[PDB]
Design a protein around this nucleic acid. Sequence first.
RNA 1: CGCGACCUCAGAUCAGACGUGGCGACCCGCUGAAUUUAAGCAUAUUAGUCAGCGGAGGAGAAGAAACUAACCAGGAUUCCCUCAGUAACGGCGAGUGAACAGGGAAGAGCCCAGCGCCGAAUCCCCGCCCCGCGGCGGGGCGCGGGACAUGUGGCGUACGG
RNA 2: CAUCUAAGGCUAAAUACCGGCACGAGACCGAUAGUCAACAAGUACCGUAAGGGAAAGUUGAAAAGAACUUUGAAGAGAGAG
RNA 3: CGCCGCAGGUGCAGAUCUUGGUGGUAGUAGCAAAUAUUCAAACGAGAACUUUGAAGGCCGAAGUGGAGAAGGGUUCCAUGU
RNA 4: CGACUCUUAGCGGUGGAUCACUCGGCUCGUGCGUCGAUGAAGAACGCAGCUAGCUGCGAGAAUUAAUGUGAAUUGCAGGACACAUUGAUCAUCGACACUUCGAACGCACUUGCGGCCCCGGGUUCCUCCCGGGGCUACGCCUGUCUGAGCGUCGCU
Lengths: 158, 86, 50, 122, 134, 52, 135
Amino acid sequence: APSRNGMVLKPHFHKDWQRRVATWFNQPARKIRRRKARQAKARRIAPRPASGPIRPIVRCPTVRYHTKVRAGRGFSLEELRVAGIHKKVARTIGISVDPRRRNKSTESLQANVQRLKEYRSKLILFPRKPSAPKKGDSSAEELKLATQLTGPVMPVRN
Amino acid sequence: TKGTSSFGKRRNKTHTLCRRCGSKAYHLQKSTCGKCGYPAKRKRKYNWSAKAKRRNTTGTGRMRHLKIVYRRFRHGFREGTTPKPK
Amino acid sequence: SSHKTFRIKRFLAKKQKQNRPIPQWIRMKTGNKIRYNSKRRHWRRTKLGL
Amino acid sequence: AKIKARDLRGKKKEELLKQLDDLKVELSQLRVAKVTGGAASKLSKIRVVRKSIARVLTVINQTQKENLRKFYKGKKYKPLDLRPKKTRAMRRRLNKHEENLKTKKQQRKERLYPLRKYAVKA
Amino acid sequence: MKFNPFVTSDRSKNRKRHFNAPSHIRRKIMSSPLSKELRQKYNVRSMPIRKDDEVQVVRGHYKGQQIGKVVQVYRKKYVIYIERVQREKANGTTVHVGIHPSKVVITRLKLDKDRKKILERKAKSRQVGKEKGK
Amino acid sequence: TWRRWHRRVNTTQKRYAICSALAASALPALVMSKGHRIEEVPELPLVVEDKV
Amino acid sequence: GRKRPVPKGATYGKPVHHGVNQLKFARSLQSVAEERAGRHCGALRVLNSYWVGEDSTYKFFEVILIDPFHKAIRRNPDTQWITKPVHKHREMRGLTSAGRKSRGLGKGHKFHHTIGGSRRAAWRRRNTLQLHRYR
RNA sequence: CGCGACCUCAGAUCAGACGUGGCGACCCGCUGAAUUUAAGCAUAUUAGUCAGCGGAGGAGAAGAAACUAACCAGGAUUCCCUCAGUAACGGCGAGUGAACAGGGAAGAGCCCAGCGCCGAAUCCCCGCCCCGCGGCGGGGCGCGGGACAUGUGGCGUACGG
RNA sequence: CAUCUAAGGCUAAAUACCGGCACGAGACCGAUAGUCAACAAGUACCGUAAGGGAAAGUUGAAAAGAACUUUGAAGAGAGAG
RNA sequence: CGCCGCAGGUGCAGAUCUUGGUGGUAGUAGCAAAUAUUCAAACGAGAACUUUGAAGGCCGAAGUGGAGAAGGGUUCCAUGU
RNA sequence: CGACUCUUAGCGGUGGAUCACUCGGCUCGUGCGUCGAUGAAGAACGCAGCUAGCUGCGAGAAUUAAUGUGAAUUGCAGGACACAUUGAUCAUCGACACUUCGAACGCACUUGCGGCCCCGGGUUCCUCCCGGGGCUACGCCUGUCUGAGCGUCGCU
Ligand SMILES: [Mg+2]
Ligand SMILES: [Mg+2]
Ligand SMILES: [Mg+2]
Ligand SMILES: [Mg+2]
Ligand SMILES: [Mg+2]
Ligand SMILES: [Mg+2]
Ligand SMILES: [Mg+2]
Ligand SMILES: [Mg+2]
Ligand SMILES: [Mg+2]
Ligand SMILES: [Mg+2]
Ligand SMILES: [Mg+2]
Ligand SMILES: [Mg+2]
Ligand SMILES: [Mg+2]
Ligand SMILES: [Mg+2]
Ligand SMILES: [Mg+2]
Ligand SMILES: [Mg+2]
Ligand SMILES: [Mg+2]
Ligand SMILES: [Mg+2]
Ligand SMILES: [Mg+2]
Ligand SMILES: [Mg+2]
Ligand SMILES: [Mg+2]
Ligand SMILES: [Mg+2]
Ligand SMILES: [Mg+2]
Ligand SMILES: [Mg+2]
Ligand SMILES: [Mg+2]
Ligand SMILES: [Mg+2]
Ligand SMILES: [Mg+2]
Ligand SMILES: [Mg+2]
Ligand SMILES: [Mg+2]
Ligand SMILES: [Mg+2]
Ligand SMILES: [Mg+2]
Ligand SMILES: [Mg+2]
Ligand SMILES: [Zn+2]
């Protein structure tokens, strides 16, 4: 029964909620398990960046966020074409590629291919057979200069 | 008369032992166990009786095979091998 | 009854065999805690399941 | 004066069966002495002889089984008890060969575009 | 203190493991110190008690320098019986008094090939620790 | 089990309490009122060299 | 359609549940055909099925089955997937094409009922009270 | 008025395999109430919930757009925060009620049919020899059987080839 | 005008887990409490059956668990230990 | 256990309250359906009730007799307490 | 004077509260995440020198072997056990074994009755009796053999 001034409240507790309650006592353990898996993965991919592949520069869709730029799923096929990177070689050297994204304008397209050129210049490519370097990289550039990058590769800034 | 007099006339057993589950619920005239439903391939089990489920669930008996399975799992079910002779 | 099946007679045999007192030397075992057979059954008191 | 598994293993089937028979006639004599009073020494030999019979029978069954394993070694079809008994589900799994064989399309993809080892400078 | 996440410090769990221990680890639980002479001759401190070694009772009603030969290691009751450690009951028969082996000191060890093998095993590990911390 | 066992305190208040605790641990009257037997201690913000 | 199997049409309850006729099964007749083929051939894996004919009272389908333990299936990749234990009785869990059509799965605004994998997956997520450690 | 080939069927304690039943906390497919709330009660609510049936696995399901959007555009699925007790539904009463964008955990992509080309290039089984037994493979041989042109394999799949 | 390309198929990770195997812990309960069950507990017992379902922990450090005498047929006592 | 804080499954005369125990009632109601017992002896610590003998009675063959079915399940039979 | 009754106290009973104890629970978290026709889960019946229950086990039956350990087990008894021509006990467990029901599988069961093929015995091969062993369920895939059809054809 209502009593004096108040708010008309409509709690959603008419549906046997006590049988489906998610407690979070395993939250500190889940953070530990995720952290251990992150560390194990970084050890597995030894000199490769710990975060993963490089992601493209992407503008957020709606009118609320189109002034903001974030990281996308992968570089479009038009971007890789004019950057001179094969769409099947890109994934093996740590470039994420999104075949379903198009480029409506040349400003965002050219900004992402400059991103690919800069990454391709920063990339140290270990020879497939360490005894025989074919076209990868000089031994001086990988003797000690190859370290595991931490955080996103070339993080996207506004 | 429905009380003491009528209790004297009961001398024919409705149920007998069941060759599955060993309970005295095997209806003789219907040839069906009232606890496990024996001639049916599947064991009779209902979720409205959780107490009856835990009376006859896995673990309430011997587990002659599952005890060995739980032990053998700890070594990957190795076979055809022997400890190194002394 | 006199007429009985082999399964019934074998069931009655096991019930008969376990209807005996505990041995006296059980009571001298270490950490015994058992006083007497609490599963004793008298034919007139408690009727068998079958 | 006892019997051990290790010195039973060199013996042949005939003298293993003869030793099994002699233990069986002694066990029957011990069961006779049990029901006619007997002595505590005779009663306590019942377990000793019973374990001896189990020891002989274990060696007999082990020698027979290990011979059958040798006989069926390298044959395409084996009796089910000589086959591995891992787990019903583990016996339904794909074997090691077919778990690892690839299509030619998958083989070219691995040959043409192998995953490279790389590092990214800061 | 204890840092091993797989070793328990729970009182109920420890008492359960103690009182339900199989007899082959009840042997290690029922260990006794060696005398100062034996602790010098062999570089060991403790030793599991044995059916034929000689001890002194150092605590309780039967304290003293009397050397008694152990006559029974009753692992079920966690006690040992010693030669002269006994009392008369009502009818006048002697009965051994059970004593925890941690309350005795071994003065002569019943030696065989296994005892010497264990004694050198314990001594070598102690020497390794001494030269690790040296 | 969903009893709300945990409380969240503002970071500014948790930082405040550390500052108060540190400041109080520099006064001999407050430390002795905890009962810490600091009578022959040479100086109460007691600092030792890095060799420790 | 599916006649409600109650004695004498009595559905003891409120009038909104009095319906006996004009009721419809949630799965298609093609999905029922695959289920009947799969149950009979419990040693085979249902792959798909298609329509071959119908009359007033009957619909006819042909169900493709695969023997998971034939060597022509085991030794061939691109069909080794059907031999995995997770794929036994697809037709009884709505994993075939006909069975999946009745689950409301899809992408976009028309299929919000099944975000999370299924209707019950969505319902559990939407009806579970998340009680964090710090509220 | 016989002998063959095929098609469609049948039998076998034929050779070799496979399924059944259990558990079922979590997962998938169905079926599915009423108590209760509405201060009565029928729609509504309880609730796509309890009970019922079937099927799995160490996870399951989902999943690489017949998508979101309307922007300077994003880009498989799943999970968390938020959107949001909101848009909306509702005897518009009691009550019910998502999604997109945004931030994160994780991050991975692909394969056929078809259209075509390549002397069916393809596959299973049984024997023989050899290397090994371990989840039974390799190599070679068989004018040895069978499958298969009513279509096997290689290339190739919308990102075009 | 925008956007995708249905009616064929596979796919790890992040996610779930009141059953199971093995562990660790607790501002929890302390034998009418906490599981029904600290114990020969899903036992005894009840019901034709589906099913229902308990009560019940503590000598002492050590049995050293009262030898022996005496009254009584014994239970039970008086001494003694 | 005191003091400063913290946290509750935190205070009992009632609920025809729950479980357990114990009173008065009270040495009370009662041990009254189907005619019935008596003498002697034995064993035995002990005899209205056991056993033997002697009487007097009852069931009166549709039995209080002799055997079975169902059901019970060792109750059968010896010996001992 | 007593008896009886009441009150209070001492002692003794009856009763099992309180307190102290705790090899039990409850809750949370972690890592694994494994049954079955090669017969599961479950049930029944058996198995110890003295053993009813619980526990363990399966006619090799409170356990065999192997490995580790290294002198016990124990309520009583008995007997081993040079602990080196190897070893009590316990643990582990990879060898072997694992009765009857049970998806339960020759047919059937509140009972019981078959059939086929080998082996042994009475026979002294011929098929009758006794015993032993191996088979004999349903569905289904690939292949095989034997077939059916006034199904479509070919040759004659
Ligand atoms: Mg009536
Ligand atoms: Mg009837
Ligand atoms: Mg009666
Ligand atoms: Mg291909
Ligand atoms: Mg309604
Ligand atoms: Mg066959
Ligand atoms: Mg109402
Ligand atoms: Mg009302
Ligand atoms: Mg009403
Ligand atoms: Mg349900
Ligand atoms: Mg199943
Ligand atoms: Mg999956
Ligand atoms: Mg899928
Ligand atoms: Mg696509
Ligand atoms: Mg708001
Ligand atoms: Mg709703
Ligand atoms: Mg991330
Ligand atoms: Mg093709
Ligand atoms: Mg209790
Ligand atoms: Mg108490
Ligand atoms: Mg008396
Ligand atoms: Mg309270
Ligand atoms: Mg009270
Ligand atoms: Mg009277
Ligand atoms: Mg009277
Ligand atoms: Mg008369
Ligand atoms: Mg009569
Ligand atoms: Mg009698
Ligand atoms: Mg008193
Ligand atoms: Mg052994
Ligand atoms: Mg019959
Ligand atoms: Mg013809
Ligand atoms: Zn049954």
